Amino acid sequence: APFKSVLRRHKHHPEGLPLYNDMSKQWLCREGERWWLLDARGEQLPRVAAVAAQYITGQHRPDFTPGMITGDHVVIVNIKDVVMVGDQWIRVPITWQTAYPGGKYRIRLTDMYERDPCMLMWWFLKDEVNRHFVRKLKTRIAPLEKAWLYEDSIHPHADKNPRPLCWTDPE
Amino acid sequence: MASTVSFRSDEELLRMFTAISAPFSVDGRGLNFLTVKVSKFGRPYYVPNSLLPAYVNLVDATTIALVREQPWRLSASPALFIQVLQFMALIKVFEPNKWFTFSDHAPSNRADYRHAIGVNHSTAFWGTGEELYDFMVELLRVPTMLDLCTREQMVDLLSGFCGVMPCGKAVGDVFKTITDAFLRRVRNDISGPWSAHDWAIVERMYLVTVLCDAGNNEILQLLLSDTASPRGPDFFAAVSRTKDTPTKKRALCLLQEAIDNASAKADKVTLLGLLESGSEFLLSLVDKGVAHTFATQNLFDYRILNSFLHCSLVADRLRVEQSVITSLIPSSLRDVQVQMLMSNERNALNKRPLMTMLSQLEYLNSIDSVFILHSSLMATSTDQLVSAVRRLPSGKDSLIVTMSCLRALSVKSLTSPSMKERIACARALEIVSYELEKGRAVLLPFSEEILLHDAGAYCDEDLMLWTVAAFLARELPLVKVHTLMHSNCTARTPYRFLKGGHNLLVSSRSLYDKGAPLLSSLHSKELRLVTHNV
Amino acid sequence: TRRGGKNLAWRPKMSERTLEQFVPLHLAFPRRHPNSWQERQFHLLGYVKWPKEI
Amino acid sequence: SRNGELCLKKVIISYCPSNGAPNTRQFLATHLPHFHAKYPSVSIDLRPRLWPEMAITGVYRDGSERSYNTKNLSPMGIFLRLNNLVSTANDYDQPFCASHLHFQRRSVQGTWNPWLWNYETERR
Amino acid sequence: NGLRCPDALITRTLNPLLNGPKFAVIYCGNHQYKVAVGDVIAVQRLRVEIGSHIALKKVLMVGGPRFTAIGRPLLEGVRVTAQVEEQKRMRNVVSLFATPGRRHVRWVDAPHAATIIRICEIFYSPNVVGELDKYKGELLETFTPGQHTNPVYPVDDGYDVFRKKDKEAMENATTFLDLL
Amino acid sequence: FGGFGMSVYTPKKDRRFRVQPLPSLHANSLADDTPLVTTTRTLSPNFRAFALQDGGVFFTHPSHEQVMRVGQNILAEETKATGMTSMDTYVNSRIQSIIAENTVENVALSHWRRRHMWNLVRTHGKLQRHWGV
């Protein structure tokens, strides 16, 4: 039967953790990958995260298969200009925790933005990717690496001609 | 050398790089000087010796000298520009993870991983060659450099860029600029005197474009239309990849003309190059029948085996006994069990030629174990091949060697920088030649490769080995197929490295689907389930 | 006395009194008006999309 | 049956011509002639034994064999299992699932690829 | 045979499009199968003798590299014929029913009886009435292969300021005519 | 929801793939002649519809090759002004190969480049590899 070794790759090991973009696995296929450009200026952060995740995880392809991890890369630009509906910018919490007794970190989207807006976008993309796939580390991780984030309008992927991503809101 | 780079001249630097580029190989992992293995955690990591820092410091000194101190030297001297780029391609500057990887199956991340606690602080995120590559790209993008360069220099420059780039393809802007300049020069100089060397340069440029994944339609049409001189191996290798029936037919006609001209001129080097490029192109071809007829009439097997080192006797024997082998080879490669049952029924109802797979399928079916040989097996020594040939005389085991495997062994013996590998591969060629001479082994000539492999699939050594394994598993299940190959080889996991991407027309049962192509079994572990790497 | 939460980038060792002044209320940027609301606000104000020639 | 040729080649039937379970002898007397008439191609191999195997085997075109037990099975059951042997090709044991309904995946128009419909955009 | 219609122009324009390989979506055994001229399928058991030349009556769709005919729900003039290769039982499914309370265990073996059928031929002989407009439900009296029956225009107008604008080529690329 | 009497039972979250919401209309949706779907794209006019006596609709549409060729033409028109990019060239090559293909490619595309990288990377000395060694 299948046997996953107890000797795993650990963040503290010199070998380090991999990048699934450069990995080669039976369930990774970058041949059919495309590149999209998502300008998140004036677009609500949750909506932008959901739209980006739909393409990142590959659910937008009719050949989608949950086992196979194939998705199109998405370059998100102008994350600094991302909008929140109302007072949510300071009334929406982000909560994490360490193994220590105190441990708990409660922070505001304002603080997350002041540190790194791309971090906030990454948090929301992670929430979507976990909402849809949470039972496997590879599935939880690979689409996030497929995703690309940039707070400004300058990105180095101009050598890939990322086509602008056009969508419509539910309204 | 790193200290004295700034004080050296162009010729001195060229000699320096030429001398330094010795130990490295193309397919190998440059700057991978792994000596000590530390396995205190449980998953070993290999620590490179002092050579890697030496090369890193040399590259840094070269960058400082040719970018931050003397930026005009690269523009002035195109030869140095090509030499530096070729050196940076030979050493995987943009893939430093290979510098620390010990096996392709478990690639390392010591060059792209860095944790706050202290892991990989001294081996992660080195800007090795980034500044120099950026400066070279800017020099190309701004050209006086291309104006000073020669067509050969331009082809070498484009090849160097596509080799340096980790994906194997040059930047879009650089590729476009170089291609435009080369096309302008070809159009301006073709009207004047032209030479077979110029044609070879154009063919090399076309092959470089195909490798960089573009396609120069103008160059292709020019080569197809021109008939003053025969084409070289580069053109056939380039047109092998494309998919177009008329283009393939025209390329086949050109290949026939070129082979005839080479035979008439008795140029051994040109004949062998054309034979290799042909082999590749014919494997690419879709019409397996016409490809097989072409190979049989042009005598690919005999000439290739003669070109090999210790295979002259087997080449002569194969040429003598070709008719019997062809007569014994069946028409259809599916329902082999049914065909064997019918032959047995016919036999029930009231000398020895050279052993080859397709003619001796029944012998293989009778045999219990079959070892498929691979070139990588003898990377260091011939002990495992000696063990296989010792197992051969048991009568219950057989050894299968492929023409692609023999070609790989010969090329790596003649080109590999490792003297141990060269001697081991020569010894392996001698052993295989002796075994084929005695008949205790099995050979799969190029004609049989054409007959067996998929319709229009290009097969290297690994792909041919896996097609043979899939055919044995699908038509002769009761034969236990083992594979002899180096543990570091990536072909040990076809479903992980040799996979054509997410294809809707394949499934885990395509291995047993008689009508499906053999290579469809790559996408599934069932092929690996039935084939054992020992 | 707390045994965790010592990452000063997220849990600074300053009082709520000292952080109140830095808590934003009239947050000019990032903006809170999505692009989808632009046309709706235009229509609510009652303006019209006259052709360029007008 | 495939392309008009039956996959089954021979059927081995071991029995005791006396002092044994009647089922096999009764099948031979009653049902076997009808089966032979229906499928004359199949070669019936009757094996007299002192301690019969109490099973019916079928050797197919690819050399495989499929055996059925008949310890106390009735002659009708033996006949039905013999016809099952004839019907089956004894090549695959796939499940009856939605994925496996279609043996080989095919496309007449052509499979879907990322760059099909990619450059097509909304219109009015 | 081939397509027919009272309009000679439409008949001669559409007949060449039918020539070539064809696929058919058929309904059988409460299951729908897409089949081609050389496709093997496993349908639920059909009381058909092996090696029998069989035909599929109710066909939901036919199509090819150049045309597609749909049934609402079914079609007519479709000849889908196959050969019954095998009558067997597929892989067994084991249902083990037990409850922690009562010491009763039930072991059900479901080998799904099936008939394996290889499609041998697919033919279509449609009878067309006339050209049918899409954006309007009316059907045209005159068929003009040289003009699109329903022309299409680009979306951009300039009024929608906050519109996701794609590349200009895709945004306004004209389409050819597939009948000349 | 649930009143006070009902006992709380945290259900397993539905980790299924939900179909994305669609734009909604109040007049077109309630109109009987006009269907809910509103599809009108570049290749829409090429899907000619004809009536059938039985009742069905016969659709005449361009072939897979023709659609891929139209996509390739659009890509070329987009890329001519700004110059071909690496990804644009790769996509064009893939489209052309798909158009001209008569079989299935089960091998990694990069495998050929990996094998032939000895034509790009140049080796010095007598160990240099050339065709027909």
Q: What is the 3-state secondary structure (H, E, C) of B404-459?
A: HHHHHHHHHHHHCCCHHHHHHHHHHHHHHHHHHHHCCCEEECHHHHHHHCCCCCCC
- Show residues of chain E in contact with C38, CB under 8 Å: 161-162
Distance, CA of E107 to CA of E91 (rounded, Å): 16
Sign of the torsion angle spanned by Cα atoms D31, D37, D38, D44: positive
Distance separating alpha carbons of residues A102 and D32, to the nearest angstrom: 84
> What residues of chain E have any CB closer than 8 angstroms to a CB in chain F?
10, 14, 17, 65-72, 74-77, 126-134, 137, 139, 148-152, 167-170, 173, 175-179
CA–CA gap between residue B483 and residue B473 (Å, rounded): 13
- Breaks, C-N > 2.5 A, in chain B lie after 142, 350
* Sign, CA torsion B27/B32/B37/B42: negative
Do D and A touch, 3+ Cβ pairs within 8 Å? The answer is yes
Alpha-carbon separation of residue B365 from A83, B118, B437, D62, E34 (angstroms): 70, 58, 22, 13, 37
- Give B250's contacts (C-beta < 8 A, 6+ positions apart): B224
Strand D55-60, strand D8-15: pairing:
antiparallel
CB atoms within 10 A of CB D1: 20
Helix (H, G, I), strand (E, B) or coil at E23: strand
Tell me the C-alpha distance between A2 and B42, whole Å: 20
Query: What's F46's DSSP letter?
Result: G
E140: nearest Cα among F59, F54, F48, F55: F48
The DSSP code sequence of B6-47 is GG--HHHHHHHHHHHTSS--SSS-TT--EEEEE-SSSS-EEE
- Find the Cα–Cα–Cα–Cα dihedral E29, E33, E39, E44, rounded to 10°: -20
Q: Is chain B in touch with chain F: ≥3 Cβ pairs within 8 A?
A: yes
Contacting partners of chain B (3+ CB pairs under 8 A): A, D, F
Please, which residues have CB within 8 angstroms of residue D71's CB and are 6 or more apart in sequence? Answer: D21, D54
The first and second tokens of residue E89, run together, are 């039982």
How far apart (Å, rounded) are the C-alpha atoms in residues B79 and B153?
7
Question: Using omega within 30 degrees of 0 as the cis cutoff, is the peptide bond preceding E73 cis?
Answer: yes
E6: how many CB neighbours lie within 10 A of its CB?
Answer: 10
Residues ≥6 apart with Cβ < 8 Å to F98: D113, D115, F68
Task: Give the CB-side neighbour count of residue B293, counting CA atoms within 13 A.
Answer: 5
* Residue type for position B532: H
Q: Alpha carbon of B442 to those of A46, B317, B430, B434: distances in Å?
A: 64, 14, 15, 12
User: Dihedral sign, CA of B59, B65, B67, B71?
Assistant: negative
Residues B513, D92: C-beta atoms closer than 8 Å = no
Asked if residues A62 and A25 have their Cβ atoms less than 8 Å apart, the reply is no
Residue of C nearest to A46 (CA): C34
From the CB of residue B131, how many other CB atoms can be counted at a distance below 10 Å? 16
Q: Is A17 on the interface with B (CB under 8 A)?
A: yes
What's the gap between Cα B410 and its chain centre?
13
Contacts for B452 with CB less than 8 Å, ≥ 6 apart: B333, B357, B358, B444, B467, B468, B471, B518
* DSSP code for B510: T
Rounded Cα distance between E48 and D33, Å, is 22
- In order of B462, F81, F98, the CA distances from F74 in angstroms are 38, 12, 16
Q: What DSSP string runs through E64-97?
A: -SSEEEE-SS--SSEEEEEEEEEEEEEEEEEEEE
Could you give the C-alpha distances from B20 to B31, B86, B90, F120, in angstroms and in order?
12, 12, 11, 19
Q: How far apart are the first and last CA of chain A?
A: 50
Question: Using a CB-CB distance cutoff of 8 angstroms, which residues of chain E are in contact with residue C39?
Answer: 160-162
Nearest by Cα to B238 from B259, B256, B217: B217
Question: For residues B202 and B219, is the Cβ–Cβ distance under 8 A?
Answer: yes
CB B136 within 8 A of CB B81: yes
Nearest residue to F72 via CA among D115, E65, B210:
D115
Q: Cα–Cα–Cα angle for F95, F98, F103, nearest 5°?
A: 170
State which H helix or E strand residue B130 sits in: helix B130-141
d(CA F106, CA B502): 9
Burial class (CB in 10 A: 0-12, 13-18, 19+), E122: buried
- Here the tokens at position C38 are 């632009």
Give the count of Cβ contacts less than 8 A between chain B and D. 32
Chain E CB contacts of F72 below 8 Å: none
Which of E39, E88, E93 has the CB atom closest to D104's CB atom? E39
* Burial label, F110 (beta-carbon count in 10 A; 0-12, 13-18, 19+): middle
Distance, in Å, from the CA atom of C50 to the CA atom of C41, rounded to the nearest integer, reads 16
Q: How was this structure determined?
A: cryo-EM
d(CA A154, CA B453) in angstroms, rounded, equals 48
Query: Mutating which of A166, A167, A168 best tests the E interface, going by the most E Cβ atoms within 10 A?
Result: A166
Question: Does chain C reach chain B with at least 3 CB pairs under 8 Å?
Answer: no
- Closest by CA position to B203, among listed B263, B115, B267, B270: B270
Listed as own residue / partner, the contacts of D19-26 with beta carbons closer than 8 Å and 24 or more positions apart are D20/D52, D21/D54, D21/D71, D21/D72, D23/D70, D23/D72, D23/D73, D23/D74, D23/D75, D23/D77, D23/D78, D24/D52, D24/D54, D24/D70, D24/D75, D24/D78, D26/D75
Question: Quick one: CA dihedral F90, F96, F100, F101, positive or negative?
Answer: positive
Selection from B207, B136, B212 nearest residue B168 by Cα = B212
The DSSP result for B194-211, as a single string, is --HHHHHHHHHHHHHHHH
What are the two backbone dihedrals, phi and then psi, of residue A75, each rounded to the nearest 5 degrees?
-100, 110
CB D68, CB D41: distance < 8 Å: no
Strands A35-39 and A73-77: parallel
Instruction: Quote the CA–CA distance of B328 and B82 in Å, as a whole number.
Output: 53
How far apart are the C-alpha atoms of B99 and B107, rounded to whole Å? 10
List of chains touching D (3+ CB pairs within 8 A) = A, B, E, F
Q: How far apart are CA B368 and CA B355, in angstroms?
A: 17
The bridge status of strand F57-60 relative to strand E67-70 is: antiparallel
Nearest CA to B106 out of A9, A11, A139 is that of A9
Q: Retrieve residue E33's tokens.
A: 């199968």
8 A C-beta contact, residue B504 and residue D116: no
Write the DSSP assignment of D41-83 as a string of letters. TSEEEEEE-SS---EEEEEETTS-EEEEE-SS--HHHHHHHHH
Nearest one of E24, E23, E65 to E178, comparing CA atoms: E65
| Residue A5: how many other CB atoms lie within 10 Å | 8
Rounded Cα gap, residues D42 and A9, in angstroms:
60
| Token code pair at residue F41 | 């794209």
- Asked whether the beta carbons of D48 and D15 are under 8 A apart, the reply is yes
The number of residues making up chain C comes to 54
Both structure tokens of B14: 């060229």
Give yes or no for a contact between D116 and D84, defined as CB atoms under 8 angstroms apart: no
Angle at E95 between CA E93 and CA E101, to 5 degrees: 170
Give the one of B505, B507, B516 whose C-beta lies nearest to D111's C-beta: B505
**A-proximal residues of F, 83-122, CB under 8 Å:** 85-88, 108-109
Please answer whether residues B212 and B155 qualify as being in contact, where contact means their C-beta atoms are separated by less than 8 angstroms. no
Long-range contacts of B184-187 (CB under 8 A, 24+ apart): B185/B151, B185/B154, B186/B151, B186/B219, B186/B222
Please indicate whether, in this complex, the C-beta atoms of D63 and B513 are within 8 angstroms of each other.
no
Q: Resolution of the coordinates in A?
A: 3.5
- The Cα D13–Cα D58 span in angstroms is 9
CA D19 to CA B437: how far, in whole Å? 62
DSSP symbol at B68 = I
Those residues with Cβ within 8 angstroms of residue C54's Cβ, 6 or more apart along the chain or in another chain: none
Exposure string (b/e) for E42-73, b if CB count within 10 Å is 16 or more? bbeebeeebbeebebeebbbbbbbbbbbbbee
CB atoms within 10 A of CB B191: 7
Backbone angles phi, psi at F45, to 5 degrees: -65, -20
Chains adjacent to F (≥3 CB pairs closer than 8 angstroms): A, B, D, E
